[PDB]
Amino acid sequence: YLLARGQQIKVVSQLFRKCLEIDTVIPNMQSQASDDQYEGATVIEPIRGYYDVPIATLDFNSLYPSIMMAHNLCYTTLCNKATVERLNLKIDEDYVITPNGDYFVTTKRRRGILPIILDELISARKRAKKDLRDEKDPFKRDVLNGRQLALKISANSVYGFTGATVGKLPCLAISSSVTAYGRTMILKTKTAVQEKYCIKNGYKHDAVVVYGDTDSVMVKFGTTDLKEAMDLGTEAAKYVSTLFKHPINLEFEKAYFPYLLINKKRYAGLFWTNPDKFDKLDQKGLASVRRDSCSLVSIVMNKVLKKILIERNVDGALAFVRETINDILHNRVDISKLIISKTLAPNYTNPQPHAVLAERMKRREGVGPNVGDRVDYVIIGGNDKLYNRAEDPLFVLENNIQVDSRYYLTNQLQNPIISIVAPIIGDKQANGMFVVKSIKINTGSQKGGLMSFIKKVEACKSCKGPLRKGEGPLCSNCLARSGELYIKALYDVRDLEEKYSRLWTQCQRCAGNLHSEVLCSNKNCDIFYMRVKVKKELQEKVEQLSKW
Amino acid sequence: MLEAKFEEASLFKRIIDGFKDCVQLVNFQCKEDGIIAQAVDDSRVLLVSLEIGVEAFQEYRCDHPVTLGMDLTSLSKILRCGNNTDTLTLIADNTPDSIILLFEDTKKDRIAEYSLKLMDIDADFLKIEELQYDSTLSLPSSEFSKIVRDLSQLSDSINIMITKETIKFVADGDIGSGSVIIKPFVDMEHPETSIKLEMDQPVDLTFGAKYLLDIIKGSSLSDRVGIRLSSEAPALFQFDLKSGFLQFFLAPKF
Amino acid sequence: MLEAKFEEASLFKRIIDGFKDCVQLVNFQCKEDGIIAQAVDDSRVLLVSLEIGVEAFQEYRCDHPVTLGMDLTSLSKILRCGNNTDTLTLIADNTPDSIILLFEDTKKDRIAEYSLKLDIDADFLKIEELQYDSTLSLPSSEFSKIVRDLSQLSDSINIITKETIKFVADGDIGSGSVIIKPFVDMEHPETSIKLEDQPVDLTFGAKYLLDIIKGSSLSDRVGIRLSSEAPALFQFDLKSGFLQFFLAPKFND
Amino acid sequence: MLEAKFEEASLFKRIIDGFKDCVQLVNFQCKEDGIIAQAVDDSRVLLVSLEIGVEAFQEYRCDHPVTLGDLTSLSKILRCGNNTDTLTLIADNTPDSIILLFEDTKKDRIAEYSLKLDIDADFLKIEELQYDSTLSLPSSEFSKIVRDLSQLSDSINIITKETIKFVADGDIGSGSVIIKPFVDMEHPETSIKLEDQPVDLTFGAKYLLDIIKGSSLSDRVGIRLSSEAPALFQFDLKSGFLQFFLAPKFN
DNA sequence: ATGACCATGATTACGAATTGC
DNA sequence: TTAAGCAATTCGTAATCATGGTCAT
Ligand SMILES: Cc1cn([C@H]2CC[C@@H](COP(=O)(O)OP(=O)(O)OP(=O)(O)O)O2)c(=O)[nH]c1=O
Ligand code: SF4
Ligand SMILES: [Mg+2]
Ligand SMILES: [Mg+2]
Ligand SMILES: [Zn+2]
């Protein structure tokens, strides 16, 4: 069942078991047609900017399961006004009302079964996290993290199933009640941590809730010190948990010394769980940790955030961005780093690039990616709509068709880099460095409908003077630079031949064989898409050096 | 030092707007006999090639072949800032970092000195491998533009049938079809309305309308267009100038 | 075959200029005396009726009655390909599956043949009102002006008192009232305005009025007939026929 | 009761269309002499002041001084006015709306419109200052120059040695246009005026693009520049003027 | 001469993808 | 017969609407 069935069958089995052990029968409620959406959470406004002050982070321990098991929320505790009036139940002792308006009964009347299921799931997650705590290997650390992450999905899948209209026993009352409770709880903890930690009570600064993501509140205490910020965050989380029901508990999880809040549900910073060394560099929602963006953007954003947060030198970051722009414009970026992957869908109303690509591959090759497969492509240059400009990276590598470098500069790399460097250097200074001051039109080995039977008049060098009737790589006007252009060409050829040798010898070492031919189709190797590019470029540069 | 003083800015404005959309970055080669610039679109099926001889200009002080990395959008923005009574002059120093454009009005008035930055497009200078075309037809440019427009309104693939001395356009779309059959016309009153077909070879070729929609934009410079067609060689659309041409090279889709 | 040749290509264009915006699909029923076609909007508030006689043709031959229904947006594309010196000619065979439009000149042999695929299974033609309580006539450009002026202030326009044409519209930003009286001393047989029984007071929908006034291209004089609790008649005169619009009023109490 | 009778219906139309884009809510303070109206821009950088005299109306009663507090609604109503029409403003005592009578020479065509009028105008104290430079040039020339130089940059640099120089330095390049006063042509309307101290200010392009929309009331536009005060852009009327106060950019 | 009509930016809407709780 | 939830951003393409350039008048 774990491979051909979703998360509903697990909660169904748990519910049936707990019911059988409690003398209860689950009705066969005919599933309603569908629904649009009910009211979820209330994500706080993200005060954007660059924050060098340590921002503590306080989040809830399994917010929705804690809310469920804290208020006796279940199917078997769901009363209404008529029921409480007929039974004459006292308020606040026998029955309670949720912020959504629904009625439930306290644990004094009947213990639910969703609380028991959630107790089981959180007691499993506790040991799954303890095992990660007592573990050293980073790969095994990630494995135990994935194991823990799958035990908090099911604990949240309980609430999801109670709120899932498509599926058996859809009780939207309980899902709406837990969402209302969560919203009110984050609002109350924001108010409390802004009230207690201020000037009047005897603190240095005014604590401000910088950002909130429905369970967390990134309070900024103002103290530039980091250890003091961690201690204050711990004290604040403890005081807040003091003001809630037993299963609920706020915990100080992390601190962000350099904090860059890009937008809503999008930020980055340094993970400080210890006041002596940062753990990692987070990237929430940014185009680097996404999958519908070429890996070049990911690498560039990683390096830029490393230079800005870890090393704190914006000048080097801007220089690297300029170098990357120059590489993009001059076709100095490998095809492997310009590959965008998108998950195919069954039906498409608005045509998409990967859908049309898969259709063209089926029409051309003989078989294409079915639904659910991640189709990868690059954006070739053209005039028509973008969905008509997308090609298999192997087809591009074979046919040598040019890549739309301006597209990758403006549509892929411009916006994320701008959004991450603007809070530091301003909007205009950040956008100025994205002007196209240089271009390299390849127009090479593209023999096709028109790119065939065309000449290259071989204009002069360093001046492009068409009056090159006199033979030689230079015209009589700028002949005084005949000792520098040769140096440039020769050093280009040197770099290219060194790289070519390294790549092909490396391919032979990988193939294990030396006396045999290496015909490798592995397109997931970084050196793939690069050996052929370097071979072509070295061929052209050597043919250019042969003019002297 | 290049100093190309024109006679009227509208000439150069139309020259640029004729192909500012298909291509966007060109290399203008100001040599010792005028200006010449060729480029190819990103689809690599359209090749624009412009030649303005020194006769079209009024003054030409360029003594050393210089190159200008023109971005057509910025240059069109600059040219839109010109009047219809100005003698636009393009000036450039020895090593050009920027180009100067002066729309000095004939009557003593406000001179308009704009300094447009230049780039280095680092592209190759191409040239068509010539061949005796199968049919070199001449046709009034306005009629050709109207034909392309109303036909492309239907479908996205226009076909040309040059047979038995009657130029024929056909287009088969989803909503229907459209077939224009113009006979070879000749008259003494209107020299522009002149169509003289060549029976050298019958030509049945189909081009994408997405490129003819850009070809027909340079229809204001030349009152008549010369279309050279060949079943193997790529078709040519020549818009003749006062001392040059704005000829496009298009290849039938296949 | 079906041979219907218009005197000028620019006639069919203006004829369809009224349909294109409001009418989605229409089945043209050809006869031996001319062409007629009707349709109703998807909301069933406005009814269009086309009547084109032979007198607006240089030659007509429709021996057998024909019935073809197509799209106006696609047909308008075909009609826009017509020069001001060409002659339109509808061409359809027996039981047509597609219509053929033909443009020809008179000094240079230029044949422009366009095909157009054509059926909604609906040929409901119903007209009931033949007597209205008031009849008026005014320039087509003047009425459209008042209509588009009043539509800016509200979503409805109320049009009739003794010997006066009143146009009133009340909305959020304010109100607007235009009162036009028939007598004019201009002595021009076109910009004149006539009015001929019982007071009429009915409010219509602006959007429908905007779609109706777009028929001002067919002629230079539109007649408006009003009748309480009856769809008004918005007719545009034509040399051999007319294009009349039947817009139903709104319940006001 | 306030009852104005515009000489031409197109007059008030051009008057409102010259500034209906940079401001949304204005108060028309109508008095015995005429109507005064001023308001700040939505971004609070552009100040406009409207002045109309009794000399531009065929009949102007204005019994009591009343304040007329949406430029969009006024423009939508004024759009109905045709050429052969005499727009008549009508305001009662303490009004909540306003009648705009579009009468015609032919008394068989009458069109009246009512427009619902609360604006808390932060009334500023405008005062005639002694500006460093006082020039005047044709309105079509200035509008053309601004439309030209605004494409190159968002900021425009404007007089040294009795000669103005419009310069705009952007990213795609820079543009320069020289300016010399002259009255050589018999017609003066195409003449350039200029009068004390060198001045070099820089204004945002967008506000200049909104101001040049006032090139529909007069064929000339006067410019008064001061290094320590916002500029003065005024278009002359037969019975008043419509002036603009633009705050320059930072140095 | 006056808007007419075609062409060209702003603005809105929604599909599609992915990630954040 | 079977499928956890919602909130949020970003990008592409179309539809619609304001506004200017040029033409029959
Ligand atoms: C990830 C995820 C989360 N939710 C909801 C449910 C409540 C909130 C809290 O989620 P969170 O990942 O931060 O972790 P959390 O459990 O709250 O806390 P701890 O790691 O125990 O401290 O988000 C969900 O419905 N489906 C999901 O897949
Ligand atoms: S490209 Fe990769 S898989 Fe192929 S030979 Fe080189 S290293 Fe091995
Ligand atoms: Mg949490
Ligand atoms: Mg969270
Ligand atoms: Zn040289």
Numbering used by the authors:
A (entry chain A): 550 to 1097
B (entry chain F): 1 to 254
C (entry chain E): 1 to 118, 120 to 160, 162 to 198, 200 to 256
D (entry chain G): 1 to 69, 71 to 118, 120 to 160, 162 to 198, 200 to 255
Sentences from the paper on this structure:
We introduced two mutations, D321S and E323S, into the proofreading 3′-5′ exonuclease active site of Pol3 to prevent degradation of the T/P DNA. There are three conserved acidic residues (D608, D762, and D764) in the palm domain, two of which coordinate the two Mg2+ ions (residues D608 and D764) that in turn interact with the phosphodiester bonds of the incoming ddTTP. The structure shows that Pol3 is the only subunit of Pol δ that binds PCNA, mediated through a single subunit of the PCNA trimer. Surprisingly, Pol3 is the only subunit of Pol δ that binds PCNA, using a nonconsensus PIP site that binds only one PCNA protomer of the trimeric ring. The CysA element contains a nonconsensus PIP motif (997-GGLMSFI-1003) that is substantially distinct from the consensus PIP motif, as well as a zinc finger motif (amino acids 1,009 to 1,030) with its four cysteine residues (C1009, C1012, C1024, and C1027) coordinating the zinc ion (Zn2+). Interestingly, the regulatory subunits, Pol31 and Pol32, are oriented laterally with respect to the Pol3-PCNA-DNA axis and do not interact with DNA. Importantly, the 4Fe-4S cluster is centrally located in the holoenzyme and functions to glue together the Pol3 and the regulatory Pol31 and Pol32 subunits by interacting with the OB and PDE elements of Pol31, resulting in an extensive interface of 2,360 Å2. The EM map of Pol δ-PCNA-DNA shows 22 bp of ordered dsDNA extending from the Pol3 active site and through PCNA.
The structure of the eukaryotic chromosomal replicase, DNA polymerase (Pol) δ, was determined in complex with its cognate proliferating cell nuclear antigen (PCNA) sliding clamp on primed DNA. Pol δ performs lagging strand synthesis by extending primers generated by Pol α primase every 100 to 200 nt. In fact, Pol δ has little activity in the absence of PCNA, which stimulates Pol δ activity by a factor of 30 (16).
